[PDB]
Ligand binder design. Sequence first.
Ligand SMILES: Nc1ncnc2c1ncn2[C@@H]1O[C@H](COP(=O)(O)OP(=O)(O)OP(=O)(O)O)[C@@H](O)[C@H]1O
Lengths: 590, 267, 75, 266, 186
Amino acid sequence: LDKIRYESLTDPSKLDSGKELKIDIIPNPQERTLTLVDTGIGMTKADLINNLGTIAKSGTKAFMEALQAGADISMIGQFGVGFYSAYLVAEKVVVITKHNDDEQYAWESSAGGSFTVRADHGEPIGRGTKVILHLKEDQTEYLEERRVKEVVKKHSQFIGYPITLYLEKEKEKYIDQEELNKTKPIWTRNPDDITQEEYGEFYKSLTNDWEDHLAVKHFSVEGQLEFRALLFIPRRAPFDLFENKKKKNNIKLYVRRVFIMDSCDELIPEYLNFIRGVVDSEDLPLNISREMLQQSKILKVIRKNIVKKCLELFSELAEDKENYKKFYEAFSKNLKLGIHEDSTNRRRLSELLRYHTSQSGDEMTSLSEYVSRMKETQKSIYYITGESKEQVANSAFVERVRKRGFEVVYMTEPIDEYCVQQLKEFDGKSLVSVTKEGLELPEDEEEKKKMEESKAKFENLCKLMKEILDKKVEKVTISNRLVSSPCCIVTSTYGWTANMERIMKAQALRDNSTMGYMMAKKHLEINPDHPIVETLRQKAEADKNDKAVKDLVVLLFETALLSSGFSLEDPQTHSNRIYRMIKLGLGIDE
Amino acid sequence: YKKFYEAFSKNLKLGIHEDSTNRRRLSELLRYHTSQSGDEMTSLSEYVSRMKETQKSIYYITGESKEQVANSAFVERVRKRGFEVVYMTEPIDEYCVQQLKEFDGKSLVSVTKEGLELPEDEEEKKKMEESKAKFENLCKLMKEILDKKVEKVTISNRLVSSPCCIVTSTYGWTANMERIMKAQALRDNSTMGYMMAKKHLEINPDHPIVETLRQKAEADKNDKAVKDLVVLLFETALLSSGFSLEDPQTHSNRIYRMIKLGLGIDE
Amino acid sequence: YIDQEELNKTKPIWTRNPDDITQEEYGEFYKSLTNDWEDHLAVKHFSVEGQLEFRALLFIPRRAPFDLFENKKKK
Amino acid sequence: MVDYSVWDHIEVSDDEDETHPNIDTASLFRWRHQARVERMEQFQKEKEELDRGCRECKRKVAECQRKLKELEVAEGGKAELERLQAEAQQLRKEERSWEQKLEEMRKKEKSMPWNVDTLSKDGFSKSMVNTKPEKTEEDSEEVREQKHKTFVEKYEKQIKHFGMLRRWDDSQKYLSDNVHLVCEETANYLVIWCIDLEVEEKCALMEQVAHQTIVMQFILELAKSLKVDPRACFRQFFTKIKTADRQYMEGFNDELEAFKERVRGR
Amino acid sequence: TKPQLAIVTQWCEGSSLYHHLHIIETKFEMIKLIDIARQTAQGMDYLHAKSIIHRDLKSNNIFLHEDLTVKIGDFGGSILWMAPEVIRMQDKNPYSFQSDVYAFGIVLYELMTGQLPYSNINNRDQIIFMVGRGYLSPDLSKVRSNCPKAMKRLMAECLKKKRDERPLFPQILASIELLARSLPKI
Ligand SMILES: Nc1ncnc2c1ncn2[C@@H]1O[C@H](COP(=O)(O)OP(=O)(O)OP(=O)(O)O)[C@@H](O)[C@H]1O
């Protein structure tokens, strides 16, 4: 069809018999025929012999070479052994052909060692070629409607010509259902004339969607490797986004508008699988069966480009602070997952993160804004990871830092610990948690001297607490992060924190022989301002070892363990102690 | 077999989940602990050859650690008669149990759900029916005071030495399942949050505390002490059942105030 | 000059009759198929002499590898 | 013909299919990138040395031509001329050797191959934001009335065409284009149609149409529970009903029987 | 009514070797130490064949991952583990493969013995001044009671005087494998 179309644009006289350009498919489940009438250029006897009767020979290459140098011509096919594939499902093949300046001829073959070509009389065909197939016995599935529809949809849907069918539905009429392809390609045309709504209509007919898109990128490179792309971003994350199993069919790959292969385990990484698009190209080192690309390294190169462009769009999407809340409330996990495992481009991916902070009510801020409003002597950021919004709001660690007008960030999500474990510094500043072996903050010398005196002030109960509790807490020290709570518990530098333990222990598929090595020891911090510690000092000084002192110490440690995010191993003893106190306070002797 | 089971136990428990034609011949290879063997893994086939004639179903518990399950409030009555229960302490057991529901034409019922019955004489059943009327006003009183945090607060027989315990509904995730599903990453929690975790409440008419509360509440309806008592009981029972508190700070402050009251600081 | 015929030394066991092999030979074959410092735990050796012909040999490692529950490792 | 000899050398630094069980990647990618950059800069230093040497040599050749022209009128310089000629000849032959090395080194870069920033260069790029007003909901009563009349008439003809069947995948595509088109009004008219079918007492048609109807209104109930339109939630229920479990199947049958009893008494 | 399917994890960082052999005891058997030595030798031998120089392989770079799998890294009192030719300040390129061999020998010696080299004198300036103009190396007497003899010979060959007589990595790998498949107890 393309050959005759190009040849027409010198003298209209070649179109005196048949002006329309069309392709038809006529199924017939009575003589098992699958006629494929078209209206191409046609063949002559000699050309019929040297093209259809010579393995490994193509006329398309000769026609392309013989035509000047440079034209509006892009045909598909240079190998030559492509038509004999019709013998995969066939028993007898007939081709009826006519050229403009010859007579109608018929070619009959049976996949043996000979073919019969003869002049024939019958139905006048204008200038096209009929290809009649007599199907086999056990492959009588391709005469059904749904199979043909699916096979045409999957492979050849962007051919720029009207493929039609002449099925028989319900007099029984003669239907001309033309909906085989009615979505013209849109990435070929210029980018200055397409007006939004066309992009939306193309997207709605691409992947089965009832809505419109949110962004579009339409770039193209040039040189030796040249392609065009139409990357998209959707509105709502599909519910089975992380269900995997099913082969991914979000980014395709075309060469001259013919499907070749689809995958996104090499074209884009695993944390950018919510993007649809088309990566159409022109020429590539294809395989003998056009389903694979030799020199797979090429694909990796393509990946680079796409990733870069994608990241650019994200930054641009941050220019307006109204759609970013919609995009960040549905695709937040992917950014952190990418930050976890990506060594090349992570600094740029660390600027799109949005966090709650303790100066803004319900409006998320960024890290750059946090760097903006720091104090003169402040060094490093302060962060804390928890299980809920309000559980972390009022805790024991924050109450001193927030009292001095500093700032602390909140992270309430499971993946946030994974993100923090990798990212260790931002813009020349460190990230330090508020729950790790006595973080140091700037202070006056007088308060330092007062703390030095207080360290010796409570030097005895500190050591007396040690032998009461056997191997459990490593050691107890005086700490300064509390103002209205008696005691707290922190972890150590080299090991898991509380939330890390909670997330790991609840994992389904992992071993159990690595627990002991990596879990960190726990330290106990006592506040030298609550009167309870004062009364404990009085009791410990007065008496060396009393039952009440032991009971108070155990109850205090247990409550501190409860309030610091840890999990208790024997809650029944705690409940029994509470019940004992409740009966001691409400009458009944025993 | 011990060495093979110690290392490759997890792959078998995925077969009962993902496969549907080999469950019958694969369910035999599972081996758990039990309430009669100290350190020795028994099996379901050996277990079914030890139950009494009157018993009709298999009883199981899904916990977090062996020691924590060993003295739980749920298995306090079913172990008194002499019955046997099997311990399941791993997330993969929770994932596999939801599919395996039958064995030798017998049903599996947990000890942490609603509607658990022990086939026994009608004497104690009549006694509990009689006692079901003496604790009727307290039902509606506590239903009102708890303020749409629990759905039903009735009386039943599952405890002998604990004033309260909490159980979930018949159709819905249990406590350990809820904890596991909340903990993991890649939740896509825009959906699961407002669907699950239905709960009920349980009491017993034997402890001095409940009888004292009833005798106090019959006299006064709007007293301030009953609110504090019911709140503290709900918090403690909710704690000692595998759940997690919404805000530990309030409970910690209550405990500290209680100790301060007990050691004389006042104000 | 050097004579390194060690390009192959391990003979194919799975073509022999099942009852003519000892445990030591099975262990030695398992040694030079996956680099390990332990022997096996159980071995199965059968065949299907039906319309389709195939014979298999399947082992069971003593100790599990660390990365057997990953995402996309080359199985 | 068909010469693919040009795509026979490509280098990529961050290859995810070339590792060793004793190297943690991460650092290996940095090593490869740094080595490639260092080699690139070494060759660039050599090439720029050669290029600026050739440029200054051409300038000196022009200067020597000027000197020869001025010596066509003057005289006296012979030893300097001989030394300059010998030095220029040696320099020219060594620069010819270096130029041979240069077009060999280009093929050497064809051996140590292409990189990411040599195969292609950027062209054009545009991007939109689509700041559409995503708030379009008409008045409840007016849309109910108009959809009822027109939409219900047309898609009630369609539902009368569909209802005589009992196929699932056919019902799958029918509900696919329905959720493309239909809304709650069509479902309500399906409910009233099932009511009048109950009135008409057609047992087998009752069974089939009731199967389809309970499927659709269970979709509706899930829609109400999730507060999401049935336009958006059809595929997951379809894929869980075609692969339904035996317990799910018996629960579905119990619900079917309960609904049939409810309608029979209605 | 739409159950779930169990989801696997991604990975987790293991404990470093410096922490294992300087902060905790963590004593293993001889076979495990030989296996770790063979694994790190194999990793260095692979990195050996593409002209990539590790340029330093401090102990904290070495990772003991889950189960037993050694992994080498580049992430980063360290004046002890550069070659005696590193101290020079001439030509700004005294580095070659023998330096990596020497540092591998240092790692091997520490792995066999379990104590820091040069434990007698603790003075960084004194240590560097003595090493830059001396020939003093850690004594070979401090070895495990049941250590093999060929391993001692290999350690003696690890660093003799100069960057010309050091052995290449494939020889070390072959010798390590030969000793590995010869050692029931001794
Ligand atoms: N319907 C047709 N009308 C006219 N010529 C046809 C028709 N079908 C095939 N041909 C001719 O067949 C020859 C090529 O046949 P064949 O399909 O085997 O080779 P190919 O074009 O290299 O392969 P393909 O394009 O399928 O990859 C050409 O001369 C072409 O003109």
